[PDB]
């Protein structure tokens, strides 16, 4: 019928390139400083879309967005230091992990606009698995309170800690979410999409006591209302 | 990629039995077997299948669309079947009479299994909407073309396995959020 | 099994050198060019046949039907598909066959023609339901069943096959004709061998039938007449 | 007088590169594409004007009709024909004009749509008899009708001519579309100048519309809905 | 008489390539966020210059003048998200549909510049029109209370939610203001320009019981005062 419609729209990279929620870290700067396990499995929006393939490399770009509680915008400096695995993690507001010397880290004011940073391709392995299927150690895997059947240590990439740079306690409490986008991206493996509902991070498990339908009841198999 | 239909979508239905439409012998010919819309976005059937999850993160779709029925019984079994799809304009067709006036196929049951049905993307826009009236694409209708014939010794109950699939000229448009996640704390 | 072509000849348009009337026809070719299906008569243990005259079948279904009654002059050829399946422990046979000019006769023995016997409308031109045999043997006519073999036919044989198709020209002494005025055909199916079968195995047997007008040509445009 | 173009393009069927659904459309192009006659209106001393909505006018009136509600998607050009005549001693003009996409408009001054008036399904989509204007002075739908020569349009004019022809293709947004949901364009008639004469001259002064649809198509075939 | 006076100013790109007030969207933060439906016709000064045409195809540009009850400014961070047709609609201020995967959304100051997007042409049709002479569905359409009899169903875009990033309620009443400009405009048949005043958005009623006359009257046929 000479169809031009168009099919640029339905590939991976214009599929997986958008930020989307990955990380809300909370301070109250009454401790002095807060801490995040980098793991963007704790929202199920981008949960769902990742965990359609098994197999996924790609770069990234973060972007930090931080305000307070009645969403004000004072002026203050604030450290985002980007602390790798064995490093040594900051023990107050004022301790020797702040004078980063190499590891990296963003000054940025809580006026600016929100900061933003690019990410290589960080793991040991050739590409990210969300689903590892086995231990990271050879043992006896006991039968009752298992766990560390889905460590996947190929995945595990530091943490994140933020500080507000100042003489003493600012006292601000301090929200910051972090918003991630993927980037030159390739996938392997397709899977279906999940239909139950999330209940843990790192685990796939599901209630079975209340298994929800895939498709919704309608009254007869012989009526089109569902 | 074909991928099944929950077509027995109904409260007696629970587990595989979704997935299984059953097929028997009739006494009154002619007889209606089974119903559903073709509109993949919609709830319904096409829920339970890869294209209609895909095209749930769309707002715009177009192209045709292909359903495979894969008949289970004893090898002695035989039959046949009218598959119907009717391009909208009224409530569904109440006898095979209405219904063989659209787009059809006529099935019998032989050493292959399945049959094809593909449905032609008859519209009048380029692209329709998901449940964004002026779209939905009609009805397919499965209906008794002639019996459900088995010789003594052999279980008069069979079933029927329907798995569905977009075609080569199929294309979706305009990304968005899903509507088959739920947020309510963070930890999940 | 096979498709018999009736007479080995294609349905064509009536062409030059062989038309009278003088204006220009109408050819839907897709909306009138299709299958339509029937309902289906129940084969039981002592079914005698049943029969459609075809230029009246299609009459009132559909863009076919819609033209033919619109339309004082009419032509086309038909595909004409019989199915009928069983299990592989039964057994049965039927004869389906077309006919050219069918002409019921009617069943008595006046010898007087002004009160002699007539078949009424219905059972010259059943519709959509057909009629069943009285008389398989004499075929209805007064002529034998055994040589209805001479006519383009097929058999469903219940152990070979479960179909049956004819392909039909158009027959007729005149290039074209009124489809409510004249039925160019009847369809014929008898079971010759009686349907039997064995406790448990099904006793609902359908047979259905399947017809498609190929080429199809309607002239001479006025008020719709059905009748 | 002339015969008027309808910005200049004839009517045609819908091309490659242009269409979407897919499957063979219909052509009857015979009984289809003719022209049709409607019942007259009678031309007054105070009458202000009618209209018809054209893709249900001829929805319910032979072949073109059937194919329209046996089919799904429609689309088709049209020829228009307005007749009316006089004597040399009659005076009075009327205008003829095709308004694509006529909306009519609800007449009240409520301004919260959830109780507005609006037009019953009749006054929208009259069928053959029309409707007549309520308040040509606005079109009936608040816009001037002074405005309506940016139309395609025709003056009968008593002391000039005694016919109006416009020629219009297809208009829409997409090839094809449903002729029951639908109407592609409206045909207005309106005496701006009203009709005058003496005593013994004929009171009697009809209108007639005679329409012709150039190049149909129908596609989407099923059952027959007309609502 | 050798002119040279230009007439490149009364083409259509020229014509409607400047932006105008589309739409006004009200926040309390006492819900906590604001929802827009979008439709341009809402607003009689872009109208008129609309519906001088049958059909118009466009690209469009959007601009989001954001302010407060007084007239104030103060720092804060606000998300403007575009709800396509079928997605789910936010319910809360801290609702999951606020962690935008798929989803188009701005971040935004207060006291930044208004801020500005892009749009193309996302219509299911061939061209946006303004008049639909018919119903999209078939049934029995009654007499009485009609509706539905100019829905244009190619025509609907989805909604504009706008709230206020923050932890908690910000106590500020917000009043955005919705500007677009048409870029790369084609328009078909033109028609009557309105000479009625307008009723409803959606609706071309007028009212009968006082009608305007299109032209001002004046005393006799043969002054030249109006």
Known sequence: ????????????????????????????????????????????????????????????????????????????????????????????????????????????????????????????????????????????????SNTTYGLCPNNMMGTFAVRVVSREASQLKLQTRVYMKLKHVRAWVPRPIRSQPYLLKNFPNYDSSKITNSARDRSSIKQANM | ???????????????????????????????????????????????????????????????????????????????????????????????????????????????????????????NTHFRTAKTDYYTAGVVTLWYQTNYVVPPETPGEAYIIAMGAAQDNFTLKICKDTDEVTQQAVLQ | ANIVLAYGEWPEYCPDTDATAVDKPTRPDVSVNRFYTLDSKMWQENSTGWYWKFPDVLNKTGVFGQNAQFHYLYRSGFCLHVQCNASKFHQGALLVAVIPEFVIAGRGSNTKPNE????????????????????????????????????????????????????????????????????????????????????????AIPITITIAPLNSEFGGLRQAVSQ
């Not at chain 1, 390139?17 to 981008?46: C, E, H, K, P």
């Not at chain 1, 490093?87 to 107050?92: D, F, L, R, V």
């Not at chain 2, 079994?77 to 109440?94: C, E, F, H, N, R």
């Not at chain 2, 032989?110 to 993307?121: D, K, R, T």
């Open chain 2, 1 to 123: 990629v074909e991928t099944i239909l929950e077509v027995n979508n109904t409260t007696e239905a629970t587990g595989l039995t979704r997935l299984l439409i059953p097929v028997s012998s009739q006494n009154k010919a002619d007889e209606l077997c089974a119903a559903f819309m073709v509109d993949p976005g919609r709830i319904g059937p096409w829920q339970s299948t890869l294209v209609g999850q895909i095209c749930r993160y769309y707002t715009q779709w177009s192209g045709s669309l292909k359903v495979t029925f894969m008949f289970t019984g004893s090898f002695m079994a035989t039959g046949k079947m009218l598959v119907a799809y009717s391009p909208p304009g009224s409530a569904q067709p109440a006898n095979r009479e209405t219904a063989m006036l659209g787009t059809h196929v006529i099935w019998d049951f032989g050493l292959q299994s399945s049959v094809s049905l593909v449905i032609p993307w008859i519209s």
């Open chain 1, 1 to 144: 019928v000479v169809n031009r419609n168009g099919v640029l729209e339905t590939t991976i990279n214009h599929f997986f390139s958008r930020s989307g929620l990955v990380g809300v870290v909370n301070l109250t700067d009454g401790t002095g400083y807060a801490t995040w396990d980098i793991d963007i499995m704790g929202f199920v929006q981008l949960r769902r879309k990742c965990e359609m393939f098994t197999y996924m490399r790609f770069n990234a770009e973060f972007t930090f967005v931080t305000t307070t509680k009645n969403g004000e915008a004072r002026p203050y400096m604030l450290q985002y230091m980007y602390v790798p695995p064995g490093a040594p993690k900051p023990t107050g507001r004022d301790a020797f992990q702040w004078q980063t010397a190499t590891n990296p880290s963003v000054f940025v004011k809580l006026t600016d606009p929100p900061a933003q940073v690019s990410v290589p391709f960080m793991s040991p392995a050739s590409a990210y698995q969300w689903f590892y299927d086995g231990y990271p150690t050879f043992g006896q895997h006991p039968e009752t």
């Open chain 3, 116 to 203: 002699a016997p007539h078949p009424g409308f219905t059972t010259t031109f059943p519709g959509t339901t057909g009629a069943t045999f009285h008389d398989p043997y004499v075929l209805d006519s007064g002529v034998p069943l055994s040589q209805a073999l001479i006519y383009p036919h097929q058999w469903i044989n219940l152990r070979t096959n479960n179909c049956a198709t004819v392909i039909v020209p158009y027959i007729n002494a005149v290039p074209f004709d009124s489809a409510i005025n004249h039925s160019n055909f009847g369809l014929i199916v008898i079971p010759v061998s009686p349907l039997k079968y064995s406790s448990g195995a099904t006793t």
